Amino acid sequence: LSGAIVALILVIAGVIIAIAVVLFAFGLIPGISNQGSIQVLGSGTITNSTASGSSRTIYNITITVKNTGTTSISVTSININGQPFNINGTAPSIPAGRTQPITFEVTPASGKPNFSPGASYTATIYFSNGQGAPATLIYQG
Amino acid sequence: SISVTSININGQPFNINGTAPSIPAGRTQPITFEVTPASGKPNFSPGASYTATIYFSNGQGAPATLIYQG
Amino acid sequence: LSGAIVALILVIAGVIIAIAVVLFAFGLIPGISNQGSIQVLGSGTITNSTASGSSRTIYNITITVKNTGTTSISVTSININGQPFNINGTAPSIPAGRTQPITFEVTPASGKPNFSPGASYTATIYFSNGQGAPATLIYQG
Amino acid sequence: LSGAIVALILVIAGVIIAIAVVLFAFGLIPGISNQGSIQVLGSGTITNSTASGSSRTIYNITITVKNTGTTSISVTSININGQPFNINGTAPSIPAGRTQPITFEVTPASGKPNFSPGASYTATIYFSNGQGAPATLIYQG
Amino acid sequence: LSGAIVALILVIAGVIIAIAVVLFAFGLIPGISNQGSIQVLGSGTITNSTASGSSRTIYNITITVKNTGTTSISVTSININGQPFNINGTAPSIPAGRTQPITFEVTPASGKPNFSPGASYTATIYFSNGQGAPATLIYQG
Amino acid sequence: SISVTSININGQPFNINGTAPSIPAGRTQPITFEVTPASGKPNFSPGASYTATIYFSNGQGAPATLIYQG
Amino acid sequence: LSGAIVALILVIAGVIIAIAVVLFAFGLIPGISNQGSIQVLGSGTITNSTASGSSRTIYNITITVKNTGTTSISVTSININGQPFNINGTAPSIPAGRTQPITFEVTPASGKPNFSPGASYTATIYFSNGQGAPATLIYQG
Ligand SMILES: *[C@@H]1O[C@H](CO)[C@@H](O[C@@H]2O[C@H](CO[C@H]3O[C@H](CO)[C@@H](O)[C@H](O)[C@@H]3O)[C@@H](O[C@H]3O[C@H](CO)[C@@H](O)[C@H](O)[C@@H]3O)[C@H](O[C@@H]3O[C@H](CS(=O)(=O)O)[C@@H](O)[C@H](O)[C@H]3O)[C@H]2NC(C)=O)[C@H](O)[C@H]1NC(C)=O
Ligand SMILES: *[C@@H]1O[C@H](CO)[C@@H](O[C@@H]2O[C@H](CO[C@H]3O[C@H](CO)[C@@H](O)[C@H](O)[C@@H]3O)[C@@H](O[C@H]3O[C@H](CO)[C@@H](O)[C@H](O)[C@@H]3O)[C@H](O[C@@H]3O[C@H](CS(=O)(=O)O)[C@@H](O)[C@H](O)[C@H]3O)[C@H]2NC(C)=O)[C@H](O)[C@H]1NC(C)=O
Ligand SMILES: *[C@@H]1O[C@H](CO)[C@@H](O[C@@H]2O[C@H](CO[C@H]3O[C@H](CO)[C@@H](O)[C@H](O)[C@@H]3O)[C@@H](O[C@H]3O[C@H](CO)[C@@H](O)[C@H](O)[C@@H]3O)[C@H](O[C@@H]3O[C@H](CS(=O)(=O)O)[C@@H](O)[C@H](O)[C@H]3O)[C@H]2NC(C)=O)[C@H](O)[C@H]1NC(C)=O
Ligand SMILES: *[C@@H]1O[C@H](CO)[C@@H](O[C@@H]2O[C@H](CO[C@H]3O[C@H](CO)[C@@H](O)[C@H](O)[C@@H]3O)[C@@H](O[C@H]3O[C@H](CO)[C@@H](O)[C@H](O)[C@@H]3O)[C@H](O[C@@H]3O[C@H](CS(=O)(=O)O)[C@@H](O)[C@H](O)[C@H]3O)[C@H]2NC(C)=O)[C@H](O)[C@H]1NC(C)=O
Ligand SMILES: *[C@@H]1O[C@H](CO)[C@@H](O[C@@H]2O[C@H](CO[C@H]3O[C@H](CO)[C@@H](O)[C@H](O)[C@@H]3O)[C@@H](O[C@H]3O[C@H](CO)[C@@H](O)[C@H](O)[C@@H]3O)[C@H](O[C@@H]3O[C@H](CS(=O)(=O)O)[C@@H](O)[C@H](O)[C@H]3O)[C@H]2NC(C)=O)[C@H](O)[C@H]1NC(C)=O
Ligand SMILES: *[C@@H]1O[C@H](CO)[C@@H](O[C@@H]2O[C@H](CO[C@H]3O[C@H](CO)[C@@H](O)[C@H](O)[C@@H]3O)[C@@H](O[C@H]3O[C@H](CO)[C@@H](O)[C@H](O)[C@@H]3O)[C@H](O[C@@H]3O[C@H](CS(=O)(=O)O)[C@@H](O)[C@H](O)[C@H]3O)[C@H]2NC(C)=O)[C@H](O)[C@H]1NC(C)=O
Ligand SMILES: *[C@@H]1O[C@H](CO)[C@@H](O[C@@H]2O[C@H](CO[C@H]3O[C@H](CO)[C@@H](O)[C@H](O)[C@@H]3O)[C@@H](O[C@H]3O[C@H](CO)[C@@H](O)[C@H](O)[C@@H]3O)[C@H](O[C@@H]3O[C@H](CS(=O)(=O)O)[C@@H](O)[C@H](O)[C@H]3O)[C@H]2NC(C)=O)[C@H](O)[C@H]1NC(C)=O
Ligand SMILES: *[C@@H]1O[C@H](CO)[C@@H](O[C@@H]2O[C@H](CO[C@H]3O[C@H](CO)[C@@H](O)[C@H](O)[C@@H]3O)[C@@H](O)[C@H](O)[C@H]2NC(C)=O)[C@H](O)[C@H]1NC(C)=O
Ligand SMILES: *[C@@H]1O[C@H](CO)[C@@H](O[C@@H]2O[C@H](CO[C@H]3O[C@H](CO)[C@@H](O)[C@H](O)[C@@H]3O)[C@@H](O)[C@H](O)[C@H]2NC(C)=O)[C@H](O)[C@H]1NC(C)=O
Ligand SMILES: *[C@@H]1O[C@H](CO)[C@@H](O[C@@H]2O[C@H](CO[C@H]3O[C@H](CO)[C@@H](O)[C@H](O)[C@@H]3O)[C@@H](O)[C@H](O)[C@H]2NC(C)=O)[C@H](O)[C@H]1NC(C)=O
Ligand SMILES: *[C@@H]1O[C@H](CO)[C@@H](O[C@@H]2O[C@H](CO[C@H]3O[C@H](CO)[C@@H](O)[C@H](O)[C@@H]3O)[C@@H](O)[C@H](O)[C@H]2NC(C)=O)[C@H](O)[C@H]1NC(C)=O
């Protein structure tokens, strides 16, 4: 008798644990699937903010940005002409569903830039999502 | 009627501060309860997913995904 | 009489041992299921730390890292351009739920690197989880 | 009794094998990087190399090859104008960090090639890291 | 009395068979590696090979094949342009560590192929290690 | 504490010449050991990656990827 | 005595059920291929279909459709250039194995479109498989 009752328990338990894992897999879908992103529109600009012979050079990155997602997002880094820059001061944030010009200040992480007036540099902006967007910036002066 | 005995979040043990919530026979419903870390200090990040396992008075444990909203 | 009493004991014992194993299987789920990981954001950089004609070359790997899990984690190895490197000095550690730039020093395990200024190398960072993440590092100089 | 004891063994073994496969998937990643170690720079040259009255047609091929990996790599095959060619003698190799004009001898496998002085032929070179690369070869005579 | 004595035998046998199956699962793993031993390099060539007035249409096929396994491997079948082909005579083989132009004779199984001079045909070659590989073949006439 | 007992690389068996190394409980380590082919010869290539399987004293084995350095 | 007989029956039944599950898995493979039964080919046209200043704008969607499936399959819905539309008339249906032109009347679900002569618009047509096919319609009206 014993063998068949044990076999039946492990069938019923097998069904329970298997269905629990299938329901778990359906529960992941809202977290992993998430349409919409920050989009970068047109060219941006770089402007020299540095003043008074200060020890650190500071630049100004103005660009037009459209958040197509359902949540507020922020910038976290920029890379320009292959060189990393830190975003000095509070990083700006783009509300859900909104198009804005945004401006923020940056400093080189190491070395110095060699920008030229009217030249165009490729840049990559990284958002709080981990998602990044390639952009073109024109150096104004 | 069956009640929540314990919860573990992302491997970490947690204590249900408030009284155990209970689900009546045959019902489907939302269930809400207050919980506190058993040790240390967690740091949930907005919009990230964590796996709870909730243990009910059957001894049955169910894995579930929670998204942090705070 | 004997046969039926023994048959009944082995039914009841069968139920007990089978339910004990089902409860054990539900007890594994918190250990094996563990969402969230270390995520590597944007490009990192390599910088030459070597000095004074020393016998060992030392490099600097700076990268931005986001721990989405509920526990503190550390780096344990890096492989760059197919070559293994040791993390000289205490390996850095990323607290739960936190985004950080991290920096650590490394030395080749065998041979020598042949990095070139401004070139980009694929790398893999391995964390204490056993989980690893592919990354791109730009050699600065 | 037997059924539950077997279920417990297969549960624990299942966890061990599943974790091993996940770790293996992360362990592959470094090996993918090496597939791009080589590139071919500019046009190369074909030259008829065989001695007077000799049975074998043999050609000298010269190309500039750049190696960016951490190990020496060698030529393994060439396809010229669609024809597969055999490589004669020892294969050449490119040291790990270097860019060099490389020269080697080849002989046709599929039949008789009819190169014309000053004509330009496409080729694909194949290397010991499993990479293939497009090339242009000018037949000098 | 009988019932308990039988239960003891089936408990011990259960442990022995369960452990044997777990060890078998680990014992499979080496055999999986060999499935990727071969790759086909560049275009190959088809050539009409049959003698004047002969009943059989027969073609010569030439391709470069690289073997990276620890054993010799042979060609077992080819499918050209969707048609299955039969292989005539002895199959060719590629020595364990080598890259070679390989030549073999084939004859159509499914009907009459109508190759056109200079046209390019996709093929799948199949090898004695159970692997299949995509190939391109240019019909020379 | 556990030890290695065999390795298979690219489908070929190898013997672990000299004392097999051993890993203490709860510990992470780089380990190094020497091996010889049991039959035939390998045909490794610099920078190429080979699948391998390491077998421990448990009978448990683990798949691995090895890069041939030179 | 009984325990051994029960063990034997469950061993034999185990073999049968395991084989049945393996055969069932292959039985799904033909069924899932029905998801690809329809192809939309060539380019379609869209033309004014309303008259006499009637209250509804109505149009004509002519397309060529090939059905590779074993059953007659029908148009469930259409979306034109991102906009939802309703098929006024009864759903058209494509018989098994046929290639044919298909023509049907359609109306905007909301607002007012303004197709311009000779411009191209992308329809996606959804068939009773749940399969959706993108197609280009040129406006003729
Ligand atoms: C953005 O604005 C920044 C601040 O004005 C500029 O950085 C400053 O550049 C000065 C020289 O300018 C020229 O040369 C650069 C290459 O070195 C080039 O990128 C520029 O486009 C421009 O052609 C520099 O002056 C230093 O160097 C001069 C020689 O080049 C020398 O004459 C100066 O005496 C001085 O050493 C600034 O450096 C700082 O100068 C301070 C004195 S003063 O120059 O203000 O009178 C001194 O006290 C301080 O120690 C020294 O560091 C330099 N400023 C900084 C912070 O580095 C930058 O060029 C502008 N453009 C871009 C694209 O970044
Ligand atoms: C990172 O920094 C490291 C330390 O400065 C660099 O390693 C050092 O490289 C020196 C040569 O530099 C050039 O050649 C390299 C290839 O060999 C190349 O990777 C570099 O990009 C660069 O073009 C080397 O100097 C040795 O070799 C010279 C010939 O190449 C020769 O002129 C020197 O006399 C010397 O032999 C360094 O080696 C060490 O040199 C000591 C004397 S001194 O050079 O400091 O004056 C000597 O006492 C010592 O025994 C010898 O080993 C070499 N240092 C080390 C520790 O290996 C490295 O190139 C930099 N870049 C990268 C990408 O790693
Ligand atoms: C590479 O160089 C080799 C010599 O180093 C060449 O071999 C020589 O080929 C000559 C003809 O080449 C033509 O025909 C080939 C097939 O035979 C063909 O593959 C080539 O692409 C090309 O179209 C050959 O000349 C013989 O044949 C001629 C007719 O084809 C005839 O006019 C000649 O008189 C001669 O019989 C060479 O043979 C040698 O010729 C010597 C005299 S001379 O031709 O140098 O004036 C003669 O003394 C000698 O006995 C005879 O064998 C043959 N060998 C040599 C040493 O020249 C090979 O074709 C080259 N391949 C390419 C692709 O350029
Ligand atoms: C095809 O490739 C072959 C190698 O794969 C080449 O063989 C090499 O030929 C070099 C001289 O070739 C010159 O003269 C030919 C007439 O004899 C002419 O057809 C060629 O076009 C070319 O103008 C030879 O170099 C010798 O002369 C050099 C001075 O010019 C001197 O520096 C060298 O030391 C040598 O004496 C090559 O030399 C051999 O060199 C070996 C070292 S290495 O050159 O490979 O680095 C050395 O170990 C050996 O002892 C020596 O004999 C010679 N190389 C080989 C491997 O044989 C052939 O010329 C190429 N053909 C064409 C038409 O270009
Ligand atoms: C591979 O090579 C074989 C010869 O080595 C070819 O066999 C020859 O095929 C000729 C026609 O080929 C065409 O028709 C085939 C079906 O018959 C078809 O499979 C081919 O793809 C191609 O479309 C055939 O020519 C005969 O038929 C012609 C009409 O189709 C007619 O115009 C000819 O006069 C002739 O009757 C060959 O037969 C031989 O022709 C000799 C004269 S000549 O044609 O060489 O000028 C004649 O003397 C002889 O009696 C007669 O049998 C036939 N055999 C030979 C030796 O040429 C085969 O088709 C090739 N396959 C491919 C794919 O290219
Ligand atoms: C299709 O494949 C067949 C093999 O599967 C080929 O048969 C081989 O033909 C070689 C010569 O072919 C040349 O001449 C043909 C006209 O007769 C022409 O149609 C071809 O396009 C090609 O130009 C033959 O090689 C001989 O000649 C060589 C010099 O060119 C010499 O080096 C060889 O030793 C040989 O004398 C092949 O030779 C046979 O070779 C055997 C060794 S191996 O070559 O297989 O390594 C040897 O054991 C045997 O005794 C000898 O007779 C010959 N191979 C076979 C197996 O028959 C056929 O040409 C291919 N057809 C085409 C159109 O390419
Ligand atoms: C497809 O054909 C349809 C019917 O022929 C067109 O829809 C009808 O368009 C009439 C005017 O057409 C002009 O304006 C359109 C935008 O409204 C434009 O797309 C056309 O290209 C063209 O430039 C419209 O008539 C109304 O508006 C006129 C002014 O534009 C005015 O003169 C009329 O008196 C009328 O107010 C139709 O609306 C219908 O008109 C009926 C009277 S009559 O026009 O037949 O004399 C009226 O009884 C009815 O209530 C009113 O709805 C309009 N029909 C509909 C259903 O909207 C359509 O533009 C064509 N093209 C496309 C791309 O859809
Ligand atoms: C980077 O961000 C800092 C805040 O995160 C910001 O600090 C603020 O500074 C302003 C005034 O700064 C001026 O003076 C300093 C010298 O003290 C210069 O380096 C600077 O360029 C400006 O000219 C101050 O009003 C405010 O209270 C500060 N805020 C905080 C939170 O401390 C830095 O100024 C900024 N760096 C640059 C170069 O702008
Ligand atoms: C943790 O669990 C307790 C029981 O499960 C619960 O006690 C109940 O408390 C409410 C009123 O609590 C208020 O006042 C206390 C101070 O006494 C605060 O700490 C608390 O935040 C509230 O502001 C009471 O009406 C009820 O009868 C209690 N229930 C029982 C069974 O005793 C605690 O409230 C709960 N902790 C929190 C923060 O809610
Ligand atoms: C690798 O990590 C070591 C610690 O794990 C570290 O030791 C520390 O060294 C610093 C000073 O090191 C300098 O001098 C040595 C020669 O003695 C050079 O090799 C080195 O590059 C530095 O220039 C010392 O202050 C500190 O107390 C040491 N800490 C410990 C725990 O011993 C090594 O320096 C480091 N290697 C490199 C190359 O940085
Ligand atoms: C395989 O393992 C052996 C021990 O299990 C080891 O023996 C030791 O050998 C070393 C010195 O070996 C050198 O010389 C021999 C020739 O005699 C070479 O084959 C070898 O490659 C080395 O170059 C010796 O100091 C030590 O005492 C030996 N230990 C014992 C216990 O005998 C073998 O050397 C080793 N095989 C290889 C190839 O390393």
Author numbering:
A (entry chain L), C (entry chain I), D (entry chain J), E (entry chain G), G (entry chain K): 16 to 156
B (entry chain E), F (entry chain F): 87 to 156
From the paper:
While some archaea produce only one type of filament, the archaeal model species Sulfolobus acidocaldarius generates four. Here, we use cryo-electron microscopy to describe the structure of the S. acidocaldarius archaellum at 2.0 Å resolution, and update the structures of the thread and the Aap pilus at 2.7 Å and 2.6 Å resolution, respectively. We define distinct N-glycan patterns in the three filaments and identify a putative O-glycosylation site in the thread.
To facilitate this analyis, we improved the resolution of the structures of the thread and Aap from the previously published resolutions of 3.5 Å15 and 3.2 Å9, to 2.7 Å and 2.6 Å, respectively. Our new cryoEM maps of the archaellum, Aap and thread enabled us to build their complex N-glycans with greater precision. Measuring 110 Å, the archaellum is considerably wider than the Aap (80 Å), which is mostly due to the larger head domain of the archaellin. Considering that Aap drive twitching motility in S. acidocaldarius (and likely also in other Sulfolobales species), it is conceivable that the 3-conformer structures are linked to this function, for example enabling rapid retraction. While the Aap has the striking capability to bend up to 90°9, archaella form stable supercoils necessary for swimming motion. On the other hand, Aap do not exhibit the screw-like profile that is caused by the glycosylation domain in the archaellum. In contrast, the diameters of the Aap and archaellum exceed that of either pore, meaning that a local reorganisation of the S-layer would have to take place to accommodate these filaments. The Aap’s 3-conformer organisation possibly represents a metastable state that could facilitate the retraction of the filament.
